[PDB]
């Protein structure tokens, strides 16, 4: 609990390239470029805009530990995720086909790894039929 918070604070200081408790959006972008995930834009700007409760650009962990504290399995997120699946489903259809799911997953938004797409299809769809209910998918996604 507290050890994880301290380790995350140390990692944030390391990414900030300084011992100060600052977000350091430019240092965060540099660390992202070092991680191979070159942002190529000011994505860190909006990220901090959502990650900085006070909007200071760099604060002594204003909501970073609080960001972690967001359960990420709370019903206020499972509802949103289930609504996100509703965009691809017909009236009371659900069961969106593995083919359509793979298609929308790789050809839209940002493309994921093809093997990751196949792994997700195998994880969600176990019966093997062309029917993967969105409820089971969101249930396992917000399960653990």
């Amino acid at each position: 609990t507290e050890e994880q918070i301290a380790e995350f604070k140390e990692a944030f200081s390391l990414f900030d390239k300084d011992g100060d408790g600052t977000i350091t959006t430019k240092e965060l972008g540099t660390v992202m470029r070092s991680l191979g995930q070159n942002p190529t834009e000011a994505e860190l700007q909006d990220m901090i805009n959502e990650v900085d409760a006070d909007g200071n650009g760099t604060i002594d962990f204003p909501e970073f530990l609080t960001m972690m504290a967001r359960k990420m399995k709370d019903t206020d997120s499972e509802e949103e995720i289930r609504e996100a699946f509703r965009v691809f489903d017909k009236d009371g259809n659900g069961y969106i086909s593995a083919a359509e799911l793979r298609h929308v997953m790789t050809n839209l938004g940002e493309k994921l790894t093809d093997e990751e797409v196949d792994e997700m299809i195998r994880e969600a769809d176990i019966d093997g039929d062309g029917q993967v209910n969105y409820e089971e998918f969101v249930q396992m996604m917000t399960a653990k």
Binding site: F12, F64, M72, I81
Partner: protein
């Protein structure tokens, strides 16, 4: 390359003030050329505009030729316009055909008039007004809304035309020999009565032909009322159709906006869940929090996309029903 894409965006499918300025400028220049074409035949300022309509015309011709050859160079971006056959099918478009026709005709008229140049250039100056609206975003709307209501318009025009024919024949029969105050006869033939009918039914009412005998005035009154009210119908039908069609297009646009958000949300959520497995440890210390950051960003964007309702207050027809269903599901 990015250059071709930016150019195609600036020339076709414009968006933003940066392209609005250019299009408004070219349209204002076309309209100023047209206003110079008006004053070139007033016979009181003819010498002022009979000569400048050559230099201005050749300047506009060179400008539009450059614009045409540049917009042709941007056919590589389109997936169907690549290749020589692709450029050919791009030039197959009607608006591009009109632009090419205007260009070549202006060039030919400029070449022949200097070897009465205004005599033929006016109709071209008219056709330049048509190349202003790109992508044909105007005629498609009208075509669709006329084709949807293709049965009400036909029946109202049929009834109006039948009333016109019959009533104008009766008027001609009642006024075949009657002299006006100026000493001439108005309804000389049946075509003259048809002209009176087309002027009365559409409620123009010039006043060159007016019925005289007491049996003509009654039919004129009955026709005016009962057929003006039938020829005036296309206004309401087309208006409601236009409004409804624009609303449908706006909803389709908003729903096509909604999809990328949901895709990013699903993908990022799955990436965050599979935090088990994609010095290889210090890197893994920050990938988790970065995935959490982009997940929060995706949730924000998705909530911002599903938030609007586009007319905004359209939930009053299902306000209490939805909350009732929600609380029922809660139990």
């Amino acid at each position: 390359t990015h250059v071709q894409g930016r150019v195609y965006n600036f020339l076709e499918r414009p968006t933003g003030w940066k392209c609005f300025v250019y299009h408004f400028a070219v349209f204002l220049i076309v309209l100023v050329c047209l206003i110079f074409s008006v004053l070139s035949t007033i016979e009181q300022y003819a010498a002022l505009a009979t000569g400048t309509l050559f230099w201005m015309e050749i300047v506009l011709v060179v400008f539009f030729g450059t614009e045409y050859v540049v917009r042709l160079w941007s056919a590589g971006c389109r997936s169907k316009y690549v290749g020589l056959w692709g450029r050919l099918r791009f030039a197959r478009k009607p608006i591009s055909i009109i632009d090419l026709i205007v260009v070549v005709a202006s060039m030919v008229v400029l070449c022949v008039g200097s070897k009465s140049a205004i005599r033929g250039i006016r109709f071209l100056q008219i056709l330049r007004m048509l190349h202003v609206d790109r992508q044909g975003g105007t005629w498609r709307l009208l075509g669709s809304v006329v084709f949807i209501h293709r049965q009400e318009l036909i029946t109202t025009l049929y009834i109006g035309f039948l009333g016109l024919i019959f009533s104008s024949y009766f008027v001609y029969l009642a006024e075949k020999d009657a002299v006006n105050e100026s000493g001439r006869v108005e309804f000389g033939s049946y075509a003259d009565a048809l002209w009176w009918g087309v002027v009365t039914v559409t409620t123009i009412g010039y006043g060159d032909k007016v019925p005289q005998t007491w049996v003509g005035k009654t039919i004129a009154s009955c026709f005016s009322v009962f057929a003006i009210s039938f020829f005036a119908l296309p206004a309401g039908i087309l208006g409601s159709g236009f409004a409804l069609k624009v609303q449908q297009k706006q909803r389709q646009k908003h729903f096509n906006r909604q999809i990328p958000a949901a895709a990013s949300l699903i993908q990022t959520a799955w990436r965050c869940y599979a935090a088990e497995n994609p010095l290889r440890e210090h890197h893994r210390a920050t990938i988790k929090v970065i995935r959490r950051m982009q997940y929060f960003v995706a949730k924000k964007k998705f909530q911002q996309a599903r938030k609007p309702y586009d007319i905004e207050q359209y939930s009053q027809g299902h306000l209490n029903l939805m909350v009732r269903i929600k609380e029922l599901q809660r139990r």
